[PDB]
């Protein structure tokens, strides 16, 4: 990712160094009065919110390279009471106090705009998820998640398009599709295996009918086409 | 909104004139090869999309002053097949080609930050809505839409928080039967009341209880407006 590699250079030039986090650590947390800009260079994270009683809500997933800002750029105060949790085994991120970020986006607008554009991708991703859910419900949500996982992590193999993630847990898949409890996911994964859209084998989902997923996640497929044409192009 | 009025002046200083739109017009549409930055100065709009069958979906609502960009700032291509439709009687907007927005935000980083922060409000708004839906379902979504109406248009009165929006506009805010039952249930329970041709919120705490993450979003995003009624 060319724009991401250029942004990594600009940060290191300016003396910001990558940090390594391991699974379950919070890159930023909902109780911290200091807010940050996170350049997630490598790894998979999720955004969570934790209620007073302990219930964890999974709100959004990100993969490196991406940018996540916990505070508004002008006021520097929280945009919501959120954590960024590492769900891959390891992740690498540049962690920038928001006041320090402003100075740096100041003097190089090429990078101001790279971050701007990521927020736009976030916005339209949330709208596409809402639009697919409104039409095809939870079933379409899960198709969407399988679809994007296939675009990003699929390898063509004799068994289908293998979704090549470690510990791709059924529970994590449901959370990414906006569904909390496993009773609903089981139903849907059962139908998808039944109609022979997916298969489970080597700890992995294989996708054997990619067109069926496109069919039920049309607005997320359109988002991927519009926002990630190069990746989309690999399986179209 | 001081930040927004300063942006309006920046636009005009650079020669950009306001355009006027009427209800049901599209300020931008999903078929135009040119994408735009809309500075919606006055009025109420909705973002819409069309499914294969020709069914229209209402995705989001925006009120002046706000910024809505139909294309990515770097590549200038569509963020999604979306239309921006006017819902108030009238709307005033500044309509800027994306390439020209960049040059404009380049010269002035106060206004750069103003626009950037509207994206951030959008992002967080969507997540707050989703969180509320994941706790209380469609009932929470509707409580949350009325909560933001109350904070944005409400004025305290002896009869409660009057919603200072014309009635025709107010009811809309397509025509799902399940939505209409939710609204009328809040009326039945006297959370919002019709009196003397106006609508009054008489139980704000009830709305706050069922749209807690949207209430938090407004506190964090618009603390002064939140504060007026809390
Ligand atoms: Na924080
Ligand atoms: Na357009
Ligand atoms: Na107050």
Author numbering:
A (entry chain B): 2 to 237
B (entry chain A): 2 to 174, 181 to 237
Paper text:
The major regulator of virulence factors in L. monocytogenes is the transcription activator PrfA, a member of the Crp/Fnr family of regulators. PrfAWT is a homodimer in which each monomer consists of an N-terminal domain (residues 1 to 108) and a C-terminal DNA-binding domain (residues 138 to 237) linked by a long α-helix (αC, residues 109 to 137).
The prfA gene modifications included three previously characterized amino acid substitutions as follows: four of the ten mutants carried the Gly to Ser substitution at residue 145 (PrfAG145S), one carried the Gly to Cys substitution at residue 145 (PrfAG145C), and two carried the Leu to Phe substitution at residue 140 (PrfAL140F). All the previously identified PrfA* mutants, i.e., PrfAG145S, PrfAG145C, and PrfAL140F, could grow in this medium with G-6-P, as could the PrfA mutants PrfAL140H and PrfAA218G, whereas the strain carrying the PrfAA94V mutation was unable to grow. The PrfAG145S, PrfAG145C, and PrfAL140F mutants showed the highest expression levels, followed by PrfAA218G and PrfAL140H. To gain a deeper understanding of the PrfA* mutant proteins, the crystal structures of purified PrfAL140H, PrfAL140F, and PrfAA218G were determined as individual proteins and in complex with the PrfA hly promoter DNA. However, their structures showed that each of the PrfA* variants had only one folded HTH motif, with the remaining structure residing in the PrfAWT conformation. Consequently, we suggest that these mutant structures represent an intermediately activated form of the protein with features characteristic of both inactive and activated PrfA. When superimposed on monomer B, the recognition helix in monomer A is shifted up to 6 Å.
